[PDB]
Amino acid sequence: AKWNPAGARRPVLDEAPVFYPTEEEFEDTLKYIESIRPMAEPYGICRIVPPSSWKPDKSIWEGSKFSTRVQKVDKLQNRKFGFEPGPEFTLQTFQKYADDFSKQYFVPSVEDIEGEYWRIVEVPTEEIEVIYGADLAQSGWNLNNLPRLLVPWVYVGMCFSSFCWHVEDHHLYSLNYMHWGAPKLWYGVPGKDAVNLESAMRKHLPELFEEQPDLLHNLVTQFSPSLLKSEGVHVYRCVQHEGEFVLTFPRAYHAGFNCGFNCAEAVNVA
Ligand SMILES: [Fe+3]
Protein backbone atom coordinates (compact mmCIF):
# COMPACT_ATOMS: atom_id res chain seq x y z
CA ALA A 1 0.00 0.00 0.00
CA LYS A 2 1.51 3.34 1.06
CA TRP A 3 3.52 5.43 3.56
CA ASN A 4 1.71 7.53 6.18
CA PRO A 5 3.97 10.45 7.31
CA ALA A 6 1.81 11.76 10.14
CA GLY A 7 1.15 8.33 11.69
CA ALA A 8 4.87 7.97 12.02
CA ARG A 9 5.66 6.46 15.41
CA ARG A 10 9.41 6.82 15.62
CA PRO A 11 10.86 5.79 19.06
CA VAL A 12 12.80 8.33 21.10
CA LEU A 13 15.96 6.60 22.22
CA ASP A 14 19.51 7.46 23.19
CA GLU A 15 22.25 6.70 20.71
CA ALA A 16 24.46 3.63 21.06
CA PRO A 17 28.09 4.59 21.71
CA VAL A 18 30.16 4.87 18.56
CA PHE A 19 33.84 3.95 18.35
CA TYR A 20 36.45 5.16 15.85
CA PRO A 21 39.50 2.86 15.99
CA THR A 22 42.90 3.99 14.80
CA GLU A 23 45.14 1.98 12.48
CA GLU A 24 46.98 0.31 15.37
CA GLU A 25 43.89 -0.31 17.45
CA PHE A 26 42.58 -1.93 14.32
CA GLU A 27 45.44 -4.32 13.69
CA ASP A 28 44.27 -6.75 16.43
CA THR A 29 40.54 -7.30 16.55
CA LEU A 30 40.06 -9.29 19.73
CA LYS A 31 42.25 -6.69 21.43
CA TYR A 32 40.50 -3.55 20.20
CA ILE A 33 37.23 -5.09 21.33
CA GLU A 34 38.68 -5.87 24.75
CA SER A 35 39.92 -2.31 24.49
CA ILE A 36 36.43 -0.75 24.35
CA ARG A 37 34.54 -3.55 26.11
CA PRO A 38 34.35 -1.67 29.43
CA MET A 39 32.95 1.55 27.96
CA ALA A 40 30.58 -0.16 25.44
CA GLU A 41 29.35 -3.15 27.47
CA PRO A 42 26.92 -1.25 29.69
CA TYR A 43 24.73 -0.54 26.60
CA GLY A 44 24.53 -4.02 25.10
CA ILE A 45 25.40 -2.69 21.63
CA CYS A 46 27.95 -0.41 19.97
CA ARG A 47 28.96 0.79 16.50
CA ILE A 48 32.55 0.58 15.31
CA VAL A 49 33.58 2.67 12.31
CA PRO A 50 36.85 1.55 10.61
CA PRO A 51 39.71 3.94 9.79
CA SER A 52 40.50 5.12 6.23
CA SER A 53 43.17 2.47 5.91
CA TRP A 54 40.42 -0.16 5.69
CA LYS A 55 39.06 -1.55 2.43
CA PRO A 56 36.70 -4.54 1.87
CA ASP A 57 31.87 -9.45 -9.30
CA LYS A 58 29.68 -10.12 -12.36
CA SER A 59 28.45 -13.64 -11.56
CA ILE A 60 28.09 -13.83 -7.78
CA TRP A 61 25.72 -11.06 -8.68
CA GLU A 62 24.05 -12.34 -11.87
CA GLY A 63 24.43 -16.10 -11.26
CA SER A 64 24.72 -16.98 -7.55
CA LYS A 65 21.28 -17.99 -6.27
CA PHE A 66 19.78 -17.88 -2.76
CA SER A 67 16.43 -18.30 -1.00
CA THR A 68 14.28 -15.88 0.90
CA ARG A 69 11.70 -16.10 3.61
CA VAL A 70 8.48 -14.08 3.75
CA GLN A 71 7.76 -11.62 6.62
CA LYS A 72 4.45 -10.03 7.61
CA VAL A 73 5.87 -6.76 8.96
CA ASP A 74 2.35 -5.79 10.05
CA LYS A 75 2.01 -8.86 12.27
CA LEU A 76 5.44 -8.97 13.90
CA GLN A 77 3.98 -7.84 17.24
CA ASN A 78 0.20 -7.61 17.11
CA ARG A 79 -1.46 -10.94 16.11
CA LYS A 80 -4.03 -13.37 17.69
CA PHE A 81 4.15 -19.40 13.20
CA GLY A 82 7.30 -18.36 11.34
CA PHE A 83 8.39 -16.87 8.04
CA GLU A 84 7.14 -19.13 5.25
CA PRO A 85 9.40 -19.76 2.27
CA GLY A 86 9.79 -17.08 -0.36
CA PRO A 87 11.01 -17.13 -3.99
CA GLU A 88 14.65 -17.56 -5.00
CA PHE A 89 16.78 -14.66 -6.20
CA THR A 90 20.17 -13.54 -7.43
CA LEU A 91 21.50 -10.40 -5.86
CA GLN A 92 20.58 -8.83 -9.17
CA THR A 93 16.90 -9.71 -9.23
CA PHE A 94 16.45 -9.40 -5.48
CA GLN A 95 17.64 -5.81 -5.82
CA LYS A 96 15.28 -5.05 -8.65
CA TYR A 97 12.41 -6.37 -6.53
CA ALA A 98 13.61 -4.65 -3.35
CA ASP A 99 14.04 -1.29 -4.97
CA ASP A 100 10.72 -1.29 -6.78
CA PHE A 101 9.13 -1.96 -3.44
CA SER A 102 10.71 1.10 -1.83
CA LYS A 103 9.89 3.25 -4.85
CA GLN A 104 6.22 2.34 -4.66
CA TYR A 105 5.63 2.22 -0.89
CA PHE A 106 6.81 5.87 -0.72
CA VAL A 107 13.31 9.62 -1.23
CA PRO A 108 12.75 9.20 2.54
CA SER A 109 15.29 9.63 5.36
CA VAL A 110 16.35 7.11 8.02
CA GLU A 111 13.93 8.84 10.34
CA ASP A 112 11.15 8.92 7.76
CA ILE A 113 11.36 5.12 7.44
CA GLU A 114 12.02 4.24 11.08
CA GLY A 115 8.89 6.01 12.18
CA GLU A 116 7.00 4.39 9.32
CA TYR A 117 8.40 1.00 10.16
CA TRP A 118 7.18 1.03 13.76
CA ARG A 119 3.89 2.49 12.65
CA ILE A 120 3.45 -0.68 10.62
CA VAL A 121 4.23 -3.06 13.53
CA GLU A 122 2.45 -1.21 16.39
CA VAL A 123 -0.48 0.06 14.35
CA PRO A 124 -0.70 -1.49 10.93
CA THR A 125 -3.35 -0.19 8.53
CA GLU A 126 -2.77 -2.81 5.86
CA GLU A 127 -0.87 -6.06 5.49
CA ILE A 128 2.65 -5.40 4.26
CA GLU A 129 4.86 -8.32 3.28
CA VAL A 130 8.66 -8.28 2.81
CA ILE A 131 11.38 -10.76 1.78
CA TYR A 132 14.86 -11.53 3.08
CA GLY A 133 17.84 -13.72 2.45
CA ALA A 134 19.49 -15.07 5.57
CA ASP A 135 22.11 -17.64 6.61
CA LEU A 136 23.66 -17.78 3.17
CA ALA A 137 43.90 -7.97 6.45
CA GLN A 138 44.88 -10.54 7.99
CA SER A 139 42.74 -9.06 10.80
CA GLY A 140 39.62 -10.71 12.25
CA TRP A 141 37.63 -7.80 10.90
CA ASN A 142 37.65 -10.00 7.80
CA LEU A 143 35.00 -12.06 9.58
CA ASN A 144 36.01 -15.42 8.05
CA ASN A 145 39.29 -15.12 10.04
CA LEU A 146 37.87 -14.98 13.59
CA PRO A 147 36.80 -18.63 14.24
CA ARG A 148 40.56 -19.26 14.69
CA LEU A 149 41.71 -16.53 17.08
CA LEU A 150 31.63 -21.06 14.34
CA VAL A 151 31.28 -19.60 10.89
CA PRO A 152 30.41 -16.17 9.31
CA TRP A 153 26.88 -16.07 7.86
CA VAL A 154 25.45 -13.66 5.25
CA TYR A 155 22.21 -11.69 4.93
CA VAL A 156 20.35 -9.87 2.21
CA GLY A 157 17.39 -7.74 3.23
CA MET A 158 15.26 -4.90 1.87
CA CYS A 159 13.30 -1.93 3.31
CA PHE A 160 11.41 -3.18 6.40
CA SER A 161 12.89 -6.71 6.51
CA SER A 162 13.65 -7.04 10.21
CA PHE A 163 15.67 -9.29 12.49
CA CYS A 164 13.69 -9.62 15.70
CA TRP A 165 14.59 -9.70 19.38
CA HIS A 166 16.94 -12.44 20.53
CA VAL A 167 20.09 -12.90 22.54
CA GLU A 168 23.08 -14.58 20.96
CA ASP A 169 23.28 -18.39 21.13
CA HIS A 170 25.46 -18.94 24.21
CA HIS A 171 27.07 -15.89 25.74
CA LEU A 172 28.53 -14.94 22.42
CA TYR A 173 28.99 -11.56 20.91
CA SER A 174 27.88 -11.06 17.32
CA LEU A 175 30.15 -8.85 15.13
CA ASN A 176 28.39 -7.50 12.00
CA TYR A 177 29.70 -5.87 8.86
CA MET A 178 27.41 -4.02 6.49
CA HIS A 179 29.03 -4.73 3.12
CA TRP A 180 26.95 -2.72 0.77
CA GLY A 181 23.40 -1.41 0.62
CA ALA A 182 21.15 0.76 2.79
CA PRO A 183 21.44 1.49 6.55
CA LYS A 184 20.49 -1.18 9.09
CA LEU A 185 18.74 0.22 12.17
CA TRP A 186 19.62 -1.52 15.48
CA TYR A 187 18.11 -1.72 18.98
CA GLY A 188 20.10 -2.96 21.95
CA VAL A 189 19.25 -3.74 25.57
CA PRO A 190 22.19 -4.17 28.01
CA GLY A 191 22.64 -7.64 29.56
CA LYS A 192 21.62 -6.64 33.09
CA ASP A 193 18.36 -5.54 31.49
CA ALA A 194 17.55 -8.90 29.92
CA VAL A 195 15.14 -9.54 32.81
CA ASN A 196 13.28 -6.27 32.20
CA LEU A 197 12.95 -7.04 28.47
CA GLU A 198 11.39 -10.51 28.72
CA SER A 199 9.63 -9.56 31.98
CA ALA A 200 8.12 -6.64 30.03
CA MET A 201 7.20 -8.80 27.04
CA ARG A 202 5.34 -11.37 29.13
CA LYS A 203 3.55 -8.39 30.76
CA HIS A 204 2.05 -6.66 27.70
CA LEU A 205 1.83 -9.75 25.42
CA PRO A 206 0.63 -12.57 27.66
CA GLU A 207 -1.45 -14.50 25.13
CA LEU A 208 1.42 -15.46 22.80
CA PHE A 209 3.69 -16.91 25.45
CA GLU A 210 0.62 -18.92 26.35
CA GLU A 211 0.55 -20.72 23.01
CA GLN A 212 4.30 -20.46 22.31
CA PRO A 213 6.07 -20.58 25.70
CA ASP A 214 9.41 -20.18 23.86
CA LEU A 215 9.05 -17.02 21.72
CA LEU A 216 12.31 -15.56 22.93
CA HIS A 217 14.18 -18.39 21.13
CA ASN A 218 11.94 -18.00 18.11
CA LEU A 219 13.25 -14.78 16.58
CA VAL A 220 9.77 -14.15 15.14
CA THR A 221 8.66 -11.36 17.51
CA GLN A 222 9.48 -7.66 17.38
CA PHE A 223 8.78 -5.71 20.56
CA SER A 224 8.54 -1.93 20.32
CA PRO A 225 11.34 0.08 22.07
CA SER A 226 8.80 2.77 22.90
CA LEU A 227 6.95 0.25 24.96
CA LEU A 228 10.00 -1.29 26.61
CA LYS A 229 11.00 2.21 27.49
CA SER A 230 7.55 2.45 29.12
CA GLU A 231 8.42 -0.29 31.65
CA GLY A 232 11.82 1.30 32.34
CA VAL A 233 13.95 -0.72 29.95
CA HIS A 234 17.04 0.87 28.42
CA VAL A 235 16.95 0.71 24.61
CA TYR A 236 19.88 2.16 22.64
CA ARG A 237 19.54 2.92 18.96
CA CYS A 238 22.11 2.76 16.25
CA VAL A 239 22.40 3.05 12.50
CA GLN A 240 24.91 0.93 10.64
CA HIS A 241 25.86 2.54 7.31
CA GLU A 242 27.81 0.91 4.48
CA GLY A 243 31.17 -0.27 5.83
CA GLU A 244 30.68 -0.07 9.58
CA PHE A 245 30.44 -2.91 12.09
CA VAL A 246 27.93 -3.40 14.90
CA LEU A 247 28.90 -5.26 18.03
CA THR A 248 26.32 -6.95 20.24
CA PHE A 249 27.75 -7.82 23.66
CA PRO A 250 27.03 -11.15 25.40
CA ARG A 251 23.64 -11.81 26.95
CA ALA A 252 22.56 -8.57 25.19
CA TYR A 253 19.16 -8.25 23.47
CA HIS A 254 19.11 -7.06 19.88
CA ALA A 255 16.61 -6.25 17.14
CA GLY A 256 16.51 -3.80 14.22
CA PHE A 257 15.46 -3.63 10.56
CA ASN A 258 16.89 -2.60 7.16
CA CYS A 259 16.22 0.69 5.47
CA GLY A 260 16.33 -0.76 1.99
CA PHE A 261 18.25 -3.22 -0.15
CA ASN A 262 21.43 -4.14 1.73
CA CYS A 263 23.75 -7.07 2.28
CA ALA A 264 25.57 -8.04 5.45
CA GLU A 265 27.66 -10.64 7.28
CA ALA A 266 28.08 -11.57 10.97
CA VAL A 267 29.91 -14.00 13.29
CA ASN A 268 29.44 -15.05 16.85
CA VAL A 269 32.47 -15.01 19.26
CA ALA A 270 33.52 -14.74 22.96
FE1 LIG B 1 21.95 -11.63 16.21
Name the residue ranges covered by the structural domains of the chain: 1-270
Residues in the chain: 270
Closest-CA residue to 242 (of 268, 217, 260): 260
CA distances from 214 to 75, 81, 185 (A): 18, 12, 25
* 237 to 94, 186, 190, 221: CA distances (angstroms): 28, 6, 12, 18
Give the resolution value in Å. Answer: 3.0
For the beta carbon of residue 207, count every other beta carbon within 10 angstroms.
10
Q: Binding residue per annotation — 204?
A: no
CA dihedral sign, ordered 214, 45, 256, 140: negative
Tell me how far the alpha carbon of residue 6 lies from the centroid of ligand 1, in angstroms: 31
Instruction: Give the sign of the dihedral formed by CA 100, CA 105, CA 108, CA 112.
Output: negative
Q: What is the largest CA-CA distance in the chain?
A: 53
Please state which CATH number belongs to domain 1-270.
2.60.120.650
Secondary structure in 3-state letters for the chain? CCCCCCCCCCCCCEECCEECCCCCCCCCHHHHHHHHHHHHHHHCEEEECCCCCCCCCCCCCCCCEEEEEEEEHHHCCCCCCCCCEEEEEEHHHHHHHHHHHHHHHCCCCHHHHHHHHHHHHHCCCCCCEEEECCCCCCCCCCHHHCCCCCCCEEEEECCCCEEEEEECCCCCEEEEECCEECCEEEEEECHHHHHHHHHHHHHHCHHHHHHCCCHHHCCCCCCCHHHHHHCCCCCEEEEECCCCEEEECCCCEEEEEECCCEEEEEEEEC
Question: Ligand 1 centroid to 92 CA: how many Å?
Answer: 26
Cβ proximity of 191 and 252 under 8 Å:
yes
- How far away, in angstroms, is 168 Cα from ligand 1 center? 6
Measure 138 CA to ligand 1 centroid, in angstroms: 24
168 is in an annotated binding site: yes
CA 38, 42, 43: angle at the middle one, nearest 5?
A: 125
Q: In whole angstroms, how far apart are CA 119 and each of 4, 160, 208?
A: 8, 11, 21
